[PDB]
Amino acid sequence: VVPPRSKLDSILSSGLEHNIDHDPLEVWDKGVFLNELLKQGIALSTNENGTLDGELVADEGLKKGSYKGTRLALTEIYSILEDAAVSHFDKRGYEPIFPVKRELDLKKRIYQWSDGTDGYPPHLKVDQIFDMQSKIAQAVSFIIPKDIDHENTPYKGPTLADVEKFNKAQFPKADIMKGRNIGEYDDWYSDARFAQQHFSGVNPSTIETASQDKIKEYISEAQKQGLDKVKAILEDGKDILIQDYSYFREATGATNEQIFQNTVYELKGTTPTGKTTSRYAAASVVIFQLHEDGRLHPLAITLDYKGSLDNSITIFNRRLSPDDTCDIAEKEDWPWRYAKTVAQTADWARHEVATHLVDTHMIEEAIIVATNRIIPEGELLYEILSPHWFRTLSLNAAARKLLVPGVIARIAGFGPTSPSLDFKGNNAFKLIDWSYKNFNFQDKYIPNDLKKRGFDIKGDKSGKYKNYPYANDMYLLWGIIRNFVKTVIESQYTSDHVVQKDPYIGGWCKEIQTNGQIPTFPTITTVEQLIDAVTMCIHTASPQHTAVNYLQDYYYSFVPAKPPALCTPLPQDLSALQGYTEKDLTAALPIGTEDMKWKDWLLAAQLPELLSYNLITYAKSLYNVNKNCKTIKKAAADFYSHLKSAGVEFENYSKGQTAGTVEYPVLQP
Amino acid sequence: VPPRSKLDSILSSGLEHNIDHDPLEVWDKGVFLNELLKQGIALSTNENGTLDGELVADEGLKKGSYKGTRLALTEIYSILEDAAVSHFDKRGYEPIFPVKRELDLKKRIYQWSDGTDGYPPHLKVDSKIAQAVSFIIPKDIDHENTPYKGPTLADVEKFNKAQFPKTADIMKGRNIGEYDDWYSDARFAQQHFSGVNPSTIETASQDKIKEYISEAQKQGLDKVKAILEDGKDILIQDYSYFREATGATNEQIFQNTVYELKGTTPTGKTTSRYAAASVVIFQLHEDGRLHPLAITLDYKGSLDNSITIFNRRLSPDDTCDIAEKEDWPWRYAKTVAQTADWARHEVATHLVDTHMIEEAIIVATNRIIPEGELLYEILSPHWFRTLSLNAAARKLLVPGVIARIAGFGPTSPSLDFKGNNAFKLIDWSYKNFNFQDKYIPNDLKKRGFDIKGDKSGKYKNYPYANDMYLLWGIIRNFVKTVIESQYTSDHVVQKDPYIGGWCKEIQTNGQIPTFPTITTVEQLIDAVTMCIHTASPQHTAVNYLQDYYYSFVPAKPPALCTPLPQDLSALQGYTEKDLTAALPIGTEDMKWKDWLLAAQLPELLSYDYNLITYAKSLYNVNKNRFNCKTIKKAAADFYSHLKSAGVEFENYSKGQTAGTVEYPVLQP
């Protein structure tokens, strides 16, 4: 044998077999990271007695870093804040960790309404890190060094072809799709793949039938540009759809003559340095047409809709049909690619703010709070709803404290500036307020939502909805959750009067409509209204949130496919836009070593991991504890069977898409 | 085919899937928290918000299923840990978001407990939770398709194999049952070198050898006597200190009478579990195979006063008339010794020697060294979330599980935690720990192994020893490079403002007198190496294959389900039924509950967690502005060597004699 004293010596004495630099950091050792924060003064300061100051320790933030280290640093600090939140909510008893029995009267003292002065819609009033409720938002600009090595980063460029190349090199190799992005497709820019996102990407649920009036406007704007075939297509008017972001102005208080801009101040600790960076945004409008075979096809994009099409800049597609051929390949149609990117920035905002944050997280929270204030724990409604809300309130607070003012409001183009002293005077937050105000609980029950946005998913046998798997899956899933809810709710609620004389349903509806500020929540008096509202809550908690968030990384990670905002002003008119080139597009995306664009790319690629990083386990758990609980038992067995049966159907709607179309695995049990 | 037609065909048609064929794997956390409520497995409160002291439920659960109760315990435990983690954040014992705190404020926060709780000294934290585990374990369960049902060994062996995941980390998901000869002497003794307690076996002394030489002559056994007399490499694993450590007299029997509570009051039904202060003598052959020779069931002061049985096989290759499989007395003896090891491992080697000593050192460090300092900066990462977890263990794991399934008693549950034998055992283990003797090189030398120099290959089946010699020196080298960046001569150590009181704090309040009084750089290097040793690889060696070794309970049961035999003659007439009766197999005598807890303890103790991520994290923060340039190269070198060592641990594993279970446990 070689003895162990010889093996030891040969390892210590000989050169190194393995060079650390060839092995990049994948996740921080938690202990080491917490320390480095300390050493850097990225930490809360305190007085002799133990109480907080209000301030951090470090006066300035970090100097140097590397995209990969800063990327993971943001992630870790965020996950720290969430634990901090979780722990804080345990102490207060907003979400206790070890269960606690609490009368309904003590819960009214614990669960209170915030008052709107933090700048948010109504939520749990919150009041160690959440005791001074800003200083945490500080700590994120402190982790983002003032400059980083730009070599071997995903934004360096200088061209799209460069960042495409880099993107693919970072891929590993349904389960898979998680670990790649839309860059995997060489034609990530294609009209087909662009519009497809309005049916099966992260915001599948806001596109709607275009109205006769809008159609008329574009018929008129088409005529002005001497474009006869477009005019005909529109005038004939068969299945014209619209995705309409023009409400950005209405929702921020913007006038039609004002331009969306976010001037970003470089701070040195807290004071500015003089250096600024502007990001720009737009209240775009896309008109599409949906063909018989199923392919949604884009016809027109209005970059920023300023009151009328006369006052705006509309560009029409050279291809009038998925199969049309122009002399200029889609790849080199730069104005149109610019237009498409612009519309993508609009969708980023509407998705992130309204469809994700507002329509799943913040409405749900108003309902969580009201439920705890109004229904005692023993009751059926409580018993059925509460499992879907676990650890939800604490997470919503991290988002409020840090995610919106630190990231969403930093990389948007709404401004007016960043950072911002008051969040009431900040456009992102007004946009959140408006989304909240204009949410309609009932209109968003799946069957009403499709019918209203104008889709006969339910009955159509033509196959023109085969490329709308969100719709097809959700019709089916919604009815399966409903059926479950029904079997359970009907075990006690045997006629509409049991609902009408329930001691709690009445004030619950009231609490929500008023303090919760969701007037569109039903005033429940029927069993069918009770079934539907509860189905919407389970819908909102699991599958809607999962549809709207699970492929967030896939769609945003490769920033050129769907950038948060523009890095340059919009063109001054149509003529300018028609002369756009690859450089005009590229300038407007966060690519290169200049204008703090790396910081934008960094945050834009990170947001998914910060927002990301099921119903069978539910059904299975429910069946086991319940072994009228005999009715609750069979309801959960049946529910289990049907979700499985549906899984096969979602994989069919995914396959049944037209050829080449990206998969839709998002609702797999 | 529209979605209204798919919906109808799913609702109307019979069920395509039957839930019972798809067994619960993990609880939906929301549902479970609710059930606890509905069942009153929850803390009660007054109108104002303050606690009562009591739970809600008067009684515990009635009905359940092994799988659901298995996972229920797991969940409730993980809940308690979060509760702990959250509670330590509020108090500021382990803040989650960092905060800067002067050394004088930390003395107010980090205080010494006072021994009143029955434990050795630990962080002072500022019996209704133990209640809540007996409440989650229903008073009866469906016994069909469970791993204890039996009625025979051959039945529970058959079941065990069927639950293996379907076809290193493989090994994670399976247990020693995988081997048909799990009962074999070879596999039994091998555990004393490469199973969860590899580090307590030692050379037998001339006096012990003499006792067994005498007891051998009494039984007319001449070849054994010769082997022992010749005396070449005789080793011992000696649990006889169980009595000394509990205050037991030689004329008292280890027993734990288990009271069935109906809420809080007993029902009259009781169940006894029994334990023993066994002693195994082994002999270690030239080829490398440790072989057992004698087992003393319960050493009562002298061998005259005890019951020793000697192996019929005097050698790994020996053949008797009776196959190992049907040598029932000897299989009984071996199981008995296994119960001894379970206790020593769980109490001393795991919870005392890694978790509780470490905590005393964590507390002293925060009381004595300011955060900025080097020692603080290098030690603290290895202690992440450790204190909160030690508290869960104190509140619930020891009184609820370890003290329930042991045979030390005297009863369970127990009002008094002092005067509970399990705790006295923990007190004694803590007292008799020797920090310095357990530095790896001293630990091998002391237990009597020339691992360091041997070229014969008689330690080729001791991969813990071989790996640890090598790992210990790699961690030391790292520690040295770092410690020497500021500690350049023994005087820097002698005039340090903090190392002096740190050593004192630990020796006194921490009650580890065996901690060095550090005045040299080499004493500083060694102590820090031991702390990293204790935090990562020792803890990993003694805990990572806990599931492998314990989850098939007959291979290593926590305690006996029946008294020991009244004398040697009785034992020699033992049969399969005598063994089986003494293991937790069957529907009766609350044995399912013991099997349940015994198989669960690993999952409760076994819960982003290694030295490579460490080295890699350290390298990266020290690439931007002691000397950080020296700390950088130290962590690069450390990384390279751990990887280079990984190959050497896989060699020591392969280099074992043929058929010997793998030892993947220290893989980076």
Ligand SMILES: [Fe+2]
């Ligand atoms: Fe979300």
Ligand SMILES: [Fe+2]
């Ligand atoms: Fe442990």
